[PDB]
Amino acid sequence: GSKPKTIVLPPNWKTARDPEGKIYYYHVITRQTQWDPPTWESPGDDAS
Numbered sequence: 001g002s003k004p005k006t007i008v009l010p011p012n013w014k015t016a017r018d019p020e021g022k023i024y025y026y027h028v029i030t031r032q033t034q035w036d037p038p039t040w041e042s043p044g045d046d047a048s
Contacts, residue, residue, distance in 0.1 A: 004041030004048035015042050 008014050012026035023038045027045075041048060 002043050002046055002048050004039065004043040004046075006040060007042045007044070013045075015039050 006016065008016055009028065011028065012031055013028035015023060015025040017023045017040055023040045025034050025036070025039065026032060027034070039048060
């Protein structure tokens with residue numbers, strides 16, 4: 001199924017939480033940030 005995992009690429013392309021438990025997500029391409037539905041997890045990048 002499309003169940004995501006906490007997969008950390010060195011800087012971006014990934015989703016993670018900071019010490020406060022709040023998620024932040026970046027995609028490596030432009031080092032862009034999103035407002036897209038909070039997801040601490042990661043199907044790589046899909047509808048998880």
